[PDB]
Amino acid sequence: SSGLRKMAQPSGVVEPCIVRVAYGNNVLNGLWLGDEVICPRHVIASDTSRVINYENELSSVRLHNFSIAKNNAFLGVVSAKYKGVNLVLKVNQVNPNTPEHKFKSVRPGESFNILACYEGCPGSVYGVNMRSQGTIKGSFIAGTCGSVGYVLENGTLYFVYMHHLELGNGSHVGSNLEGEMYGGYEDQPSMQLEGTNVMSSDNVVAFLYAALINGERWFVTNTSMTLESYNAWAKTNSFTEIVSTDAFNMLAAKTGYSVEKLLECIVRLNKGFGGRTILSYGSLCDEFTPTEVIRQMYGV
C-alpha cells in the first residue's frame, strides 16, 4: 500500500545559484550562473500595474540602485540587457558554486521542480507539471517572483523555468531562461486569459496503473477501447492522442491489465468518479508521468 504523491528532486545544486536582486525598492529572485545573473525585467519597472515601455526603462537604468546579494557576496552590476522577458546582468564576480547546467524548455505533460524563493531566500521545493496552455499550478506567494524551475536527467541539471505572472484563475505563467514566455503570454499587466488545457493521456494511464499496483481496482471495466478509437475520442475531448503502448508494456504485464482496458476507463471515468476515489483523488490527474510512477512503485 503506497499512495501516489508528488516528490521533488533535491534542491542543493540549485540553491547556491539563487540570488537576491533589488533595484530601488523592487526586490525579487535572480539566477546567478558564471559571471551573469538572470531575473525578470520588472525589477526595473517604475510600476507594475499598467503597461511598461520596457525599452525606455532599459535606457533609464542606473547601476548603483542595484542591490544584488548572495551569502557574503555583494555583486556589482557591470552591465544590463534584455533576453526576452528577463534581464541579463553581468556582475563582477563569478559564482564559485556554478554547477554543470543546461537550459531547455519543458513540454506539456512533463514534470519538473519549483524552488520557491522569497527575495533571495529559497523557501520550499515541490513537483509540478507543465500544461498545454503553458501554465502551471504553483504555490507562488508574493515575494517569489523569479523563482526557478529545474529538472535533473542523467544527472544533467536543466534550468527550465523562471516565475513571472499569475492569471485570474490562479494559473501561473513563467518563462524559460532564454526569456521566452510559456504559452506566449506577454509580460504585461494586461487582460490575458488561459485557454483550455489538453489532458495528458500518457500521464492518466500511468495514474491508473499506479492505482492497480496499489490494489485499487473498482474502476476496471468488463470491456476496452482500441488505441485508434481512443485517439478519435481524445481529439474531441481535450485529451492527447496515444502514440504507442510501448512505455506501458512493463506496467501492463505487471498488473495484467492492457492499455486498451485503461483507455475505456479514461472515457467512463471522465464523466465523473461517482463519489468514489482513486488513489484518494476525486478525478483523473494527469500530473504523474509513466516514469515517475514506475520509479516510485519499483525504484531505480
Partner: peptide, 5 residues
C-alpha cells in the same frame, strides 16, 4: 487580469 509577480 494578469498580475506581475
Amino acid at each position: 487580469x494578469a498580475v506581475l509577480x
